[PDB]
Design an enzyme around this catalytic site. Structure first.
Site, short mmCIF file in Angstrom:
data_model
loop_
_atom_site.label_atom_id
_atom_site.label_comp_id
_atom_site.label_asym_id
_atom_site.label_seq_id
_atom_site.Cartn_x
_atom_site.Cartn_y
_atom_site.Cartn_z
N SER A 294 42.85 12.28 32.85
CA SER A 294 41.63 13.00 33.18
C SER A 294 41.97 14.37 33.76
O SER A 294 43.08 14.61 34.24
CB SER A 294 40.77 12.21 34.17
OG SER A 294 41.40 12.09 35.43
N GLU B 265 52.66 17.80 12.56
CA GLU B 265 51.64 18.19 11.60
C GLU B 265 50.31 18.51 12.27
O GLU B 265 49.48 19.21 11.67
CB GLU B 265 51.46 17.08 10.56
CG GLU B 265 50.69 17.50 9.33
CD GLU B 265 50.96 16.61 8.13
OE1 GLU B 265 51.85 15.73 8.22
OE2 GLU B 265 50.29 16.79 7.09
N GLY C 146 47.08 8.11 35.46
CA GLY C 146 45.88 8.05 36.27
C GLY C 146 44.87 7.04 35.76
O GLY C 146 45.05 6.39 34.72
N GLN C 147 43.78 6.90 36.51
CA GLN C 147 42.80 5.86 36.22
C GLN C 147 42.21 6.02 34.82
O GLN C 147 42.15 5.06 34.04
CB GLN C 147 41.69 5.87 37.27
CG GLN C 147 40.60 4.84 37.01
CD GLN C 147 39.50 4.87 38.05
OE1 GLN C 147 38.32 4.84 37.72
NE2 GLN C 147 39.89 4.92 39.33
N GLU D 94 36.71 18.56 41.28
CA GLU D 94 37.30 18.44 39.95
C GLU D 94 37.44 19.77 39.21
O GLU D 94 38.43 19.92 38.47
CB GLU D 94 36.48 17.43 39.12
CG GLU D 94 36.82 16.00 39.47
CD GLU D 94 35.96 15.00 38.74
OE1 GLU D 94 35.07 14.41 39.38
OE2 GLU D 94 36.17 14.80 37.52
N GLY E 9 43.18 13.43 40.88
CA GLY E 9 44.35 14.03 41.49
C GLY E 9 45.64 13.66 40.78
O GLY E 9 46.56 14.48 40.67
N1 LIG Z 1 35.84 8.59 30.08
C1 LIG Z 1 36.39 8.07 31.17
N2 LIG Z 1 36.53 8.85 32.30
C2 LIG Z 1 37.08 8.33 33.41
C3 LIG Z 1 37.52 7.02 33.46
N3 LIG Z 1 38.02 6.79 34.69
C4 LIG Z 1 37.91 7.93 35.42
N4 LIG Z 1 37.32 8.88 34.64
C5 LIG Z 1 37.01 10.28 35.00
O1 LIG Z 1 38.12 10.79 35.71
C6 LIG Z 1 37.68 11.62 36.77
C7 LIG Z 1 38.29 11.09 38.05
O2 LIG Z 1 39.68 11.08 37.92
P1 LIG Z 1 40.54 9.73 37.87
O3 LIG Z 1 41.24 9.57 36.55
O4 LIG Z 1 39.67 8.54 38.18
O5 LIG Z 1 41.57 9.96 39.08
P2 LIG Z 1 43.14 9.68 38.95
O6 LIG Z 1 43.73 10.30 37.71
O7 LIG Z 1 43.38 8.19 38.98
O8 LIG Z 1 43.82 10.39 40.24
P3 LIG Z 1 43.50 9.98 41.77
O9 LIG Z 1 42.78 11.12 42.46
O10 LIG Z 1 44.82 9.75 42.47
O11 LIG Z 1 42.66 8.73 41.81
C8 LIG Z 1 36.17 11.55 36.80
O12 LIG Z 1 35.68 12.74 36.24
C9 LIG Z 1 35.82 10.38 35.92
O13 LIG Z 1 34.63 10.62 35.22
C10 LIG Z 1 37.39 6.22 32.32
O14 LIG Z 1 37.77 5.05 32.33
N5 LIG Z 1 36.82 6.76 31.19
MG LIG Z 2 42.99 6.84 40.82
#
Ligand SMILES: Nc1nc2c(ncn2[C@@H]2O[C@H](COP(=O)(O)OP(=O)(O)OP(=O)(O)O)[C@@H](O)[C@H]2O)c(=O)[nH]1
Ligand SMILES: [Mg+2]
Ligand SMILES: Nc1ncnc2c1ncn2[C@@H]1O[C@H](COP(=O)(O)OP(=O)(O)CP(=O)(O)O)[C@@H](O)[C@H]1O
Ligand SMILES: Nc1nc2c(ncn2[C@@H]2O[C@H](COP(=O)(O)OP(=O)(O)O)[C@@H](O)[C@H]2O)c(=O)[nH]1
Ligand SMILES: Cc1nnc(N2CCCCC2)s1
Ligand SMILES: Cc1nnc(N2CCCCC2)s1
Ligand SMILES: [Ca+2]
Ligand SMILES: [Ca+2]
Ligand SMILES: [Ca+2]
Ligand SMILES: [Mg+2]
Ligand SMILES: [Mg+2]
Lengths: 352, 54, 438, 425
Positions: free
Chosen positions: C140, C254, C10-11, C183, C144
């Site tokens: 995250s 560990e 994921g992102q 979320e 999703g």
């Molecule tokens: N710390 C940090 N949190 C992130 C980052 N990118 C997204 N988030 C957190 O991730 C949550 C959103 O989920 P994403 O990871 O962006 O979504 P995804 O896993 O790509 O899944 P999709 O719904 O398909 O886009 C939010 O709460 C954001 O604050 C990042 O680069 N750093």
């Molecule tokens: Mg995404």
């Protein structure tokens, strides 16, 4: 425009603080479950502290210190005084106390009997009082066999402490009493002592040859107003305020309330609160806390002050509700949420 | 306050300090879960098309 | 030498992963083109850094990583970024459209169609390992994909690699940093299906990173780049033992042995210090005791909570820089006489300590200033249950109205999985209360 | 490459649609001939979302123009940017719909729908990954209302798992063409409850009042009303057409804005709205106060008559993103009685550096409020007032409809109202 929620519909004190807040036209009350609030007047039990200080852009304040129960629980206070180097077991202002668990459940049963035998053999007055936080259930006795059997018949932790057999008796009347002091601790942890206290006197003559009748020994306002037959004879509501109690000490003992008693009261408040400050301070926390405390003291015939217990959700004297509640809003609430003297408190300065 | 198991090398060291002594679903079951959800998507989509065909 | 395959889902996982491998390269002196001069064994070697990097015959040091995202825009920043030369194409896996913050979409609908492709690519990295330890999975909670596809990946990884350990780096959702309304649903859904598949998971609360970035680094409105570089320092501190010569936390097994006595309670709280703004003219370098004292201030914790009102089950002190054992013990003794450290009666009151002499590396032009010594404390506290309570309460508010539930059912999920997952969090909350409260 | 296929049907649909393409074409740098003449790469980053790329670096809107009479579209084709639309994407008949829902939905429309779907299929076949559809139309006429919703039903049958959004102009007696508008609106609202994921409710009465009272226009025209809808449409699609940390397609937006499948009717809002004292700089406090003021909202619903399920706000311009958060959190924390407390953090804000043409900064408001029930109440009331006497019903029974279909639409919309009322408590 500040918002607050109410989560304890039984608080006489904060029910007035909530009434004053609205009167300012600058505070708004929300439902008890709305998370977007500035001030929480929380519940007494299981206050969800973990849900404070996570709302973006909100400074959240609560009227309870997480961890102050250590001080306001009978068996907790005993353990705190004995295990805290700031207080030590040689604490000179706390009656000898022991934590005793009922035999149906560490415990200090054997340690209690050790000092007990010492008094019995040493011809010394060996009368103790048993009590527990689950009481309205108190037992005063001079025999250890009765004290321990009273605890086993129950099912909650109890504490046995020495009964002050030489309490300072007011005259005329020859009657016991206790001193209630209200203490406010703000978010910065300044310790403010309300300039006004009350004595909850016993309308009955103190009788040291019959602890069976618990009306002349227990100075509570409910016991004196329910079982005592001379309620309201000497002072209205078995409550004597400092002005009268001070003039009495000057005419009787040629001393003042400040020198003879209040110096010790202020010392005891500072010791207890400074002790737990590192454990409950919110100075570096994501939310802020304050709390009103009710300290209950005893005075003996030597003009020595004893600490009896600390109440975390105390009530207030009917005559002192307006002033004190306003003082809460002044130094506790408005000091963090300012609105668009001669302080009623006595700042007990200290090192943080 | 005892130190034990002191390990030293050129890039650092590590040790232990003791202050006080003490007092799954198989590959098949997952495939069923995945296909179970897919079937419920097919049923819901069948009802949508049946609704649109009406 | 045993290898560790990193998986970024994921992102959030991909971007965080991007900031870690940037830091890993600066720490092991690996250039963007993959070359590493100090590595005198060309196209071979079983050194400490080889747990994370393989070597080509042409001297390229390739990360043992897999990037997975159901939508290609984030991973395309890696394909064209500074370190585009480190990974080969098979390592970057992208779908067409994302999970739309819908757990059921990332787990069932889309996850079903791409899971076998990811496992195959992971098998490729595994087939280059003479003794794979396990996997580090970054994701995250709210996304999703990060929630939905991760939980499916963890179920399959347990099947294909039973004897392997699995660690998580999970991003806990916070409204400060960009967040959505659903979320809390995704967080609880993923924690439920992932719990029995994760041996140890480090939660980073975005609210904590946001506050540290504003308070210490003096960033008005921090971005993901600010948050991720700060997060990678903590990740680097936690994985340094696996990549450097040492004796503490030398393999993934560990981590469970030192930090997790009870399997379900596998969420250690992380604390890091010092975080010093590089824009400062010049800061007074903190001492071993001072940075060790900072590990007990709530302001530098990865998850906002109050450790003073919990019970510790384990505790690791990981130092980097000019630190010697004498200073550590001198500071520890000083803190036991001051702080409120309540250990559980069935756990020794001790601290495993690790010192790595190389001080923290900072990305040039970044926000973090070079410091001569820093520490990361990994402590398993019941106090972290506050984070489950906070999150479980947001779930209860929406689920009482069944708000947004139709989006998950529409993807093939049964409504029963909601309550089943919520009752697992209720059991998890009780486990913490049995270990902490009296 | 998350493409959106745009569809505009009927007189209102195409005139509002035309101005929409005129506005965003300006923001993306496309000129009337389809050639890009911008100065920033940000104008081309997400350009494929609404435009196709032809030979010679030309950009052709992914827009399908539908109508049952040739008048309006002949005007579009001769309009400012008329040359920019794909000639094959004009699908029109000659009979017209006579402001009659049944004609657009069952008779005249049914004859033309397959050729429209032939053009939708053609546009979707070239999309790398279709986000979904958006339709501009009114609900009070015949083509946009009756045939528009027929198109939605047939688009859903063929693309069941794609997002379908609409900008829907609701009728009002104050700005009315025929007395049968409540009939056509009530019939359309039932289709939309079932077949759209998001519907932006644009009330012609709110548009009129804004032009009269706020803009100080003595005699507003449809052009004046459409200027407001253009600006609003450009604002809600800013997060789709420009880069940023958002990374959200239509489905992710819908998932987070729609807590219940039927309650997906939104109240849009825009700020500033100044009369010609127009060069003055607008502070972030002024943007936030206005964007949340009823007089800036275009559904003719008083938000203080209900509660927000979810709220989204897009800020455009170079402003203090710290100041934006302070003001947004200052509006919620000063009117918490108008937000539901059982959806944590149901107010989300985004910022975009590129401001609209001729504005230092602006704010676009998207609200899912239960106060929208007031709009359906007015429609239901006007509907029943006529239907109880069967007034003007022969226009519809002559097209093959039975009274039963009217009774059902009535119940469906009164249910919708009752559904809003229970979440407001
Ligand atoms: N710390 C940090 N949190 C992130 C980052 N990118 C997204 N988030 C957190 O991730 C949550 C959103 O989920 P994403 O990871 O962006 O979504 P995804 O896993 O790509 O899944 P999709 O719904 O398909 O886009 C939010 O709460 C954001 O604050 C990042 O680069 N750093
Ligand atoms: Mg995404
Ligand atoms: N060791 C002791 N010596 C003398 N008197 C004692 C005593 N312990 C208790 N008392 C008497 O009991 C009363 C206080 O009882 P205690 O405070 O333990 O019960 P409680 O907590 O239900 C009353 P409250 O909390 O309202 O002050 C005092 O009036 C005091 O006279
Ligand atoms: N805002 C706006 N509303 C319009 C416009 N044209 C018509 N309307 C409204 O739409 C309804 C008439 O429907 P219309 O679009 O003309 O019918 P159609 O051509 O058969 O789809 C009435 O409620 C009009 O007030 C326009 O250009 N702008
Ligand atoms: C990414 C995101 N896309 N949409 C979001 N919201 C819309 C407003 C309500 C809360 C969620 S968050
Ligand atoms: C159409 C859109 N529906 N919601 C949107 N937002 C998500 C939250 C931040 C602002 C943009 S855009
Ligand atoms: Ca080598
Ligand atoms: Ca396993
Ligand atoms: Ca015909
Ligand atoms: Mg009591
Ligand atoms: Mg018309």
């Amino acid at each position: 425009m500040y918002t607050f929620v109410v989560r304890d519909e039984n608080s006489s004190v904060y029910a007035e603080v909530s009434r004053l807040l609205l009167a300012t036209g600058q505070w708004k009350r929300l439902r008890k479950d709305n998370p977007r609030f500035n001030l929480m007047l929380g519940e007494r039990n299981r206050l969800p502290f973990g849900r404070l200080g996570h709302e973006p852009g909100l400074v959240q304040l609560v009227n309870y210190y997480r961890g102050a129960d250590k001080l306001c629980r009978k068996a907790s206070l005993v353990k705190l005084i004995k295990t805290s180097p700031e207080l030590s077991e040689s604490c000179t202002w706390f009656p000898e106390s022991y934590v005793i668990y009922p035999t149906n459940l560490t415990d200090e049963r054997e340690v209690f009997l050790a000092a007990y035998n010492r008094r019995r053999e040493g011809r010394e007055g060996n009368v103790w009082i048993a009590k527990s936080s689950a009481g309205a259930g108190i037992l005063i006795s001079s025999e250890a066999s009765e004290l321990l059997d009273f605890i086993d018949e129950q099912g909650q932790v109890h504490v046995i402490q020495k009964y002050l057999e030489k309490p300072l008796l007011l005259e005329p009347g020859h009657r016991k009493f206790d001193i209630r002091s209200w203490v406010l601790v703000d978010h910065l942890y300044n310790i403010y002592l309300y300039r006004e206290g009350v004595l909850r006197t016993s309308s009955e003559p103190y009788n040291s040859a019959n602890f069976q009748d618990k009306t002349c020994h227990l100075t509570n306002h409910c016991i004196q107003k329910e079982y005592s037959k001379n309620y309201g004879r000497y002072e209205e509501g078995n409550e004597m305020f400092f002005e009268e109690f001070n003039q009495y000490l000057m005419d009787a003992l040629n001393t003042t309330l400040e020198n003879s008693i209040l110096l010790q009261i202020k010392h005891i408040i500072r010791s207890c609160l400074m002790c737990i400050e590192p454990a409950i301070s919110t100075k570096h926390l994501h939310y802020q806390s304050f709390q009103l405390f009710g300290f209950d003291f005893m005075v003996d015939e030597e003009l020595k002050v004893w600490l009896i217990e600390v109440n975390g959700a105390p009530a207030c004297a009917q005559k002192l509700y307006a002033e004190l509640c306003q003082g809460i809003v002044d130094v506790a609430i408005s000091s963090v949420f300012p609105l668009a003297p001669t302080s009623i408190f006595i700042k007990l300065h200290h090192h943080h | 306050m005892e130190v034990i198991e002191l390990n030293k090398c050129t890039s650092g060291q590590s040790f232990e300090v003791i202050l006080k002594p003490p007092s799954d679903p198989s590959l098949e079951e997952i495939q069923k879960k995945l296909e179970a959800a897919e079937e419920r998507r097919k049923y819901q989509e069948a009802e949508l098309l049946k609704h649109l065909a009406e | 030498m045993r290898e560790c395959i990193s998986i970024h889902v994921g992102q959030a996982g991909v971007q965080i992963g991007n900031a870690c491998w940037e830091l890993y390269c600066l720490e092991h002196g690996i250039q963007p083109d993959g070359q590493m001069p100090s590595d005198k064994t060309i196209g071979g070697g079983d050194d400490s850094f080889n747990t994370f990097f393989s070597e080509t015959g042409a001297g390229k040091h390739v990360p043992r990583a897999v990037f997975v995202d159901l939508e290609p825009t984030v991973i395309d920043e890696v394909r064209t970024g500074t370190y585009r030369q480190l990974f080969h194409p098979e390592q970057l896996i992208t779908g067409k459209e994302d999970a739309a913050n819908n757990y059921a979409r990332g787990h069932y609908t889309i996850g079903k169609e791409i899971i076998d492709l990811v496992l195959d690519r992971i098998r490729k990295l595994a087939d280059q390992c003479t003794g794979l330890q396990g996997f580090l999975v970054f994701h995250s909670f709210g996304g999703g994909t990060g929630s939905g596809f991760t939980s499916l990946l963890m179920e399959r990884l347990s099947v294909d690699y039973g004897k392997k350990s699995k660690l998580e780096f999970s991003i806990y959702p916070a409204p400060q940093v960009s967040t959505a309304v659903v979320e809390p649903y995704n967080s609880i859904l993923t924690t439920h299906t992932t719990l029995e598949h994760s041996d140890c998971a480090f939660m980073v609360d975005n609210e904590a990173i946001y506050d540290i970035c504003r308070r210490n680094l003096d960033i008005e409105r921090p971005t993901y780049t600010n948050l991720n570089r700060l997060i990678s320092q903590i990740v680097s501190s936690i994985t340094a033992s696996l990549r450097f010569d040492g004796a503490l936390n030398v393999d993934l097994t560990e981590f469970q042995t030192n930090l997790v006595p009870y399997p379900r309670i596998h969420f250690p709280l992380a604390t890091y210090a010092p975080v010093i703004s590089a824009e400062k003219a010049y800061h007074e370098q903190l001492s071993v005791a001072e940075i060790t004292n900072a590990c007990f201030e709530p302001a530098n914790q990865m998850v906002k909570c109050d450790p003073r009102h919990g019970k510790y089950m384990a505790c690791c002190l990981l130092y980097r820089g000019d630190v010697v054992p004498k200073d550590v013990n001198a500071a520890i003794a000083t803190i036991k006489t001051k702080r409120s450290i309540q250990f559980v009666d069935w756990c020794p009151t001790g601290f495993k300590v690790g010192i790595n002499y190389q001080p923290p590396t900072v990305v040039p032009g970044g926000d973090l200033a070079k410091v001569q010594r820093a520490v990361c404390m990994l402590s398993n506290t019941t106090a972290i249950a506050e984070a489950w309570a906070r999150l479980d309460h947001k779930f209860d508010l929406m689920y009482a109205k069944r708000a947004f539930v139709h989006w998950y059912v529409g993807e093939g999920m049964e409504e029963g999985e909601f309550s089943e997952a919520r009752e697992d969090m209720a059991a998890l909350e009780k486990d913490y209360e049995e270990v902490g409260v009296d | 490459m998350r493409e959106i296929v745009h569809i505009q049907a009927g007189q209102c649909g195409n005139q509002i649609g035309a101005k929409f393409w005129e506005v965003i074409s300006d923001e993306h740098g496309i000129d009337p001939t389809g050639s890009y003449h911008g100065d920033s790469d940000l104008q081309l980053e997400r350009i494929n979302v609404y435009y196709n790329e032809a030979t010679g670096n030309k950009y052709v809107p992914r827009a399908i123009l539908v109508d049952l009479e040739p008048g309006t579209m002949d005007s579009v084709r001769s309009g400012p940017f008329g040359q920019i639309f794909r000639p094959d994407n004009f699908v029109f008949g000659q009979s017209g719909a006579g402001n009659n829902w049944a004609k657009g939905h069952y008779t005249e429309g049914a004859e033309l729908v397959d050729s429209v779907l032939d053009v939708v299929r053609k546009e979707s076949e070239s999309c790398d990954c279709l986000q979904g559809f958006q339709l501009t139309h009114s609900l009070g006429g015949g083509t946009g209302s009756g045939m528009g919703t027929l198109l939605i039903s047939k688009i859903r049958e063929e693309y069941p798992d794609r997002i379908m959004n609409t900008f829907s102009v609701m009728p009002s007696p104050k700005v009315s063409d025929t007395v049968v508008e409540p009939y056509n609106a009530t019939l359309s609202v039932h289709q939309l409850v079932e077949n759209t994921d998001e519907t932006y409710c644009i009330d012609n009465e709110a548009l009129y009042d804004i032009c009269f009272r706020t803009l100080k226009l003595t005699t507003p025209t449809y052009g004046d009303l459409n200027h407001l809808v253009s600006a609003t449409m450009s604002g809600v699609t800013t997060c789709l057409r420009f880069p940023g940390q958002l990374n959200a397609d239509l489905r992710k937006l819908a998932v987070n804005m729609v807590p219940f499948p039927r309650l997906h009717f939104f109240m849009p809002g825009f700020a500033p709205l100044t009369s010609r004292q127009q060069y003055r700089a607008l502070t972030v406090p002024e943007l936030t106060q206005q964007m949340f003021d009823s007089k800036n909202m275009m559904a003719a619903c008083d938000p203080r008559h209900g509660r927000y399920l979810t709220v989204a706000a897009i800020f455009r311009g170079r402003m203090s993103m710290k100041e934006v958060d302070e003001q947004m959190l200052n509006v919620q924390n000063k009117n918490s009685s108008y937000f539901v407390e059982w959806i944590p953090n149901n107010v989300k804000t985004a910022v975009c550096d590129i401001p609209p043409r001729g504005l230092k900064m602006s704010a676009t408001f998207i609200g899912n409020s239960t106060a929208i029930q007031e709009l359906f109440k007015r429609i239901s009331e006007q509907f029943t007032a006529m239907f109880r006497r069967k007034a003007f019903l022969h226009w519809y029974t002559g097209e093959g409809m039975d009274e039963m279909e009217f009774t059902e639409a009535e119940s469906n919309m009164n249910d919708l109202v009752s559904e809003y009322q229970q979440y407001q408590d």
